[PDB]
Amino acid sequence: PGTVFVYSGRGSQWGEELVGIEQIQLGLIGMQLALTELWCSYGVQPDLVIGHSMGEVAAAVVAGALTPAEGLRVTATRSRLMAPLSGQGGMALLELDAPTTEALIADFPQVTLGIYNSPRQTVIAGPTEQIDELITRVRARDRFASRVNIEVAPHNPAMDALQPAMRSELADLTPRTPTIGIISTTYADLHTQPVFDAEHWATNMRNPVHFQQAIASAGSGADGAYHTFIEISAHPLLTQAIIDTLHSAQPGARYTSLGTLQR
């Protein structure tokens, strides 16, 4: 049937308190790497990995493209660069398809489509006050929208200024060809076979997250079909997005979507 491990970007976290983007993101990838090995111990191993947003670092590590130390180095480097933007940007989950979302935000230069969740769910990202105005406009149209609280909002033009620093501080990264299959969510073209280098991580933090497209490709018979998707997290937040994407793209197909832990 095929098993996919899905690594979320900003999953739930909560036994000492993790404080600030750097500490929180480090506890997240630490928990992802340790939960992945726990699954392996009970015979369950991934044939393919998909990383969502900041989760693509952990997915690149599990796939063998980067070492655990290299993954932690990307995590710490990126988190330190993003920290001065703490609280400035926000995200919103909209119950709109991607073309309707693009139309809604076309006149907001600082707000972009951040994540393709599923066909009828799209996340936007940008300055928190602009995200609030857009939530109000979506609600005023008798449509649904909700805030997605995050330490620093990636996948929007505020990340452009951090890309030179990323390309510079991660210059000596030595990624390898992955040992396990990985579908990147960084590029609209899923056949852009990516080298998981400095340029890839600088691009990944700014580009939209092509999550629906990566899940649909994994579920498709093209390049082999996978039927079990396991979110490797402390609480399942992407499971309904996985099912909504797969049911829409292959309506007569059977898929199983599950988490690792639950709060």
Nearer to Na ion, 23 or 228 (CB): 228
Contacts of 59 (CB under 8 A, 6+ apart): 5, 7, 49, 50, 51, 182
Can you point out the beta strands (E) in 100-180?
A: 112-118, 121-127, 145-148
Least spacing, CB of residue 221 vs Na ion, in Å: 6
Helix (H) and strand (E) counts for the chain?
Answer: 9, 9
Contacts of 8 (CB under 8 A, 6+ apart): 52, 53, 55, 231, 233, 237, 238
- Across-strand partners of 94? 122, 145
Nearer to Na ion, 120 or 227 (CB): 227
Contact flag: residue 160 with Na ion (CB under 5 A): no
Nearer to Na ion, 64 or 181 (CB): 181
Least spacing, CB of residue 111 vs Na ion, in Å: 5
Looking only at the bridges linking them, the beta strands covering 48-51 and 181-183 are parallel
Nearer to Na ion, 39 or 108 (CB): 108
3-state secondary structure of 63: coil
| Of 48, 93, 98, 105, the one binding Na ion by CB under 5 A | 105
Contact flag: residue 223 with Na ion (CB under 5 A): yes
Contact flag: residue 94 with Na ion (CB under 5 A): no
Nearer to Na ion, 47 or 199 (CB): 47
Contact flag: residue 228 with Na ion (CB under 5 A): no
Within 10 Å of residue 31's Cβ, how many Cβ atoms? 18
| Of 108, 128, 144, 167, the one binding Na ion by CB under 5 A | 108
| Of 3, 67, 163, 220, the one binding Na ion by CB under 5 A | 220
Nearer to Na ion, 110 or 239 (CB): 110
**Number of residues forming the site for Na ion (CB under 5 A):** 6
Least spacing, CB of residue 259 vs Na ion, in Å: 22
Taking Cα atoms as reference points, which of 247, 227, 235 lies closest to residue 4?
Answer: 227
Q: Which spans of this chain sit near Na ion (rule: CB under 5 A)? A: 105, 108, 111, 220, 223, 225
